[PDB]
């Protein structure tokens, strides 16, 4: 089997991407944030505290003939940005882009934090990191990918995120029309439950490539590129007037600037992030200070290749017995 779904930016900054997912029978279509940095499939639901719902589409298990309570199971998750959600669990039929899984754990939110309530465009998350990070207790649950894997033509999914444009998530095949050149595969550590890999270095603009190992995760659920303070200082030093603002919470730059590109290494290959991908626009409406898309990881504890990096590439998440990541230009 295979699946193919379009993923669409939620706003003009590509802050996140939503992908339609069918849940239940008859289908209830919810727009989920596919997150290669977490492992829970959770949704706004008929159980979500009513004051915490503001325009999201909800899953109503009582209207699904295939929903079953997963008796006793609860979940609770906290993300890198300080957001959180929790609830109980149903199993149901879930389809993405024509690929159907029966018996998928659908984590029904009873509570969501303010950032979820305030984002009316995101109806929940579909985790695609390793199932060892799934938060369901007392019986940990599998991701949609892990449940689909055995049915897929190839045990892979691909992320092809757009710059200010829709893109695609494919499951079970690699669309050889979707990228240029060849795919460079690199080793993955699953020790922390993430798609964790080691970049071979970086360049700023037309500068020389610095060979240096940068361990980090491929995280579609994180907007920006978070890298070591040394690398981030070297990038922003090339932008007149850029500075790190403790009041704003990261590097800012004059909105009048033209930003340099940023290159990262994948083995002997190179992925170039155009400078415009690194512009996240005014810090507040009408400001001439703009927020940078490359930020320090120093206060995180991990480097994060988020959407700023990933959308510059065609990315293969190879879930073979020995997982690997692939990157191609496009």
Swiss-Prot record:
Q: What Gene Ontology molecular function terms does this protein carry?
A: aspartic-type endopeptidase activity
Q: Which GO terms describe its biological process?
A: proteolysis
Q: Which reaction does it catalyse?
A: Hydrolysis of proteins with specificity similar to that of pepsin A, prefers hydrophobic residues at P1 and P1', but does not cleave 14-Ala-|-Leu-15 in the B chain of insulin or Z-Glu-Tyr. Clots milk
List each copy of the Peptidase A1 domain by range.
17-328
* Catalytic class of the enzyme: hydrolase
Cystines in this chain: 255-290
Q: Where is the active site?
A: 35, 199
Q: Which UniProt keywords apply?
A: Aspartyl protease, Disulfide bond, Hydrolase, Protease, Signal, Zymogen
Protein EC: 3.4.23.22
Protein family according to the UniProt entry: Belongs to the peptidase A1 family.
What's the protein here called? Endothiapepsin
Give the organism the record lists: Cryphonectria parasitica
Portion of the parent chain present? 90 to 419 of 419
